[PDB]
Amino acid sequence: KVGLLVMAYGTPYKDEDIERYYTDIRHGHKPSEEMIADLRGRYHAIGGLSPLAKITEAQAYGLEKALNDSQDEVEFKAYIGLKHIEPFIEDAVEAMHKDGIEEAISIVLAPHYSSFSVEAYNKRAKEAADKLGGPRINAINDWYKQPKFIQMWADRINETAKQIPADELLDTVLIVSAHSLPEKIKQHNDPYPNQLQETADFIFEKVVVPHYALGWQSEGKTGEPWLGPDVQDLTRELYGREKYKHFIYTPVGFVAEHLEVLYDNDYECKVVTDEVGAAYHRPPMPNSDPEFLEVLRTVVWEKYSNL
Ligand SMILES: CC1=C(CCC(=O)O)c2cc3nc(cc4[nH]c(cc5[nH]c(cc1n2)c(C)c5CCC(=O)O)c(CCC(=O)O)c4C)C(CCC(=O)O)=C3C
Ligand SMILES: [Fe+2]
Ligand SMILES: [Mg+2]
């Protein structure tokens, strides 16, 4: 049996979890009352709580099922390890150890690598395994280059574009985004920004949308520059420069419908298109669609074959 360590950010299970969840996100530094209320307000705006918890489970166990049905070389056992709420990464690794799992494959539910994201996932998983003495953790760093992943997104964009009048397709633009990070990672050649540009390039060559731009979103409450431009600011510039009639947002850095999509895209971005008078489009996120499980199954299996 090979452990499948599936890792993701995590989301509060109950409204009462928001406080400790934000504290964990802030590296154990309690947010102010005013920050807590702002974040609580955003959750209420998207309906109360994020569906990320159930989607993540569906992805993790959909992947496990997908792998075990497609071959009989090994039995995969999925453990869920969350970054900022239980079950934590270290909990999942502990669960594998007590279960006797000797070798595991880990994957992050975000297709691009960065020092701030996947690297932190792998560091904590590998350090937990070290302390316990097992299991051996073979980390997958990124998988945006998976052809089925690029094609999944192209199909979703093409499905939306084919409902845009032909005489307005030329005024349609594809906005490809991911979670922003401190700009300083670009000073040491972090692959994150360039992996995102590669993703947008690969998708653009497979869609009927004639225009596209790369943006970032959800930058944090800090004092340093973050990767820009922000998807809101980019929408304004693009409309002012080209008067686009349709904006299609694909935050390909994310794999599920959660706060950073339901609010930062479906509210904040729609507010900008509403303002300039253009139409807002946001294709469904991967979630646990069969096509996406197939993407993850292909990635994990290729990683196992290379082991
Ligand atoms: C790179 C990256 C991803 C993508 C890769 C991955 O998936 O790992 C990601 C995902 C997510 N980030 C999420 C939520 C939040 N992230 C925050 C804050 C931050 N994220 C950061 C980084 C990332 N985050 C950073 C550097 C900060 C600043 C911390 C600080 O200020 O020191 C804050 C604080 C409040 C605010 O700043 O708005 C919240 C609430 C949720 C869950 C949404 C839900 O609950 O549905 C998801 C999926
Ligand atoms: Fe975050
Ligand atoms: Mg904001």
Residue numbers in the entry: 4 to 310
Show me the paper's own sentences about this structure.
Coproporphyrin ferrochelatase (CpfC) in the CPD heme biosynthesis pathway incorporates ferrous iron into coproporphyrin III (cpIII) to give coproheme, which is eventually decarboxylated to yield heme b by the coproheme decarboxylase enzyme in the final step of this biosynthetic process (Dailey et al., 2017; Dailey & Gerdes, 2015; Layer, 2021). Understanding structure–function relationships of key enzymes, such as ferrochelatase, is an essential precondition for the design of new inhibitors for antibiotic‐resistant pathogens, like Listeria monocytogenes. LmCpfC crystals in complex with cpIII were soaked with a ferrous iron solution and flash‐vitrified after 2, 3, and 4 min, to obtain snapshots of the enzymatic reaction during iron insertion into the porphyrin macrocycle. We report three crystal structures showing different iron content during metalation in LmCpfC, identifying the presence and defining the extent of the porphyrin distortions during iron insertion.
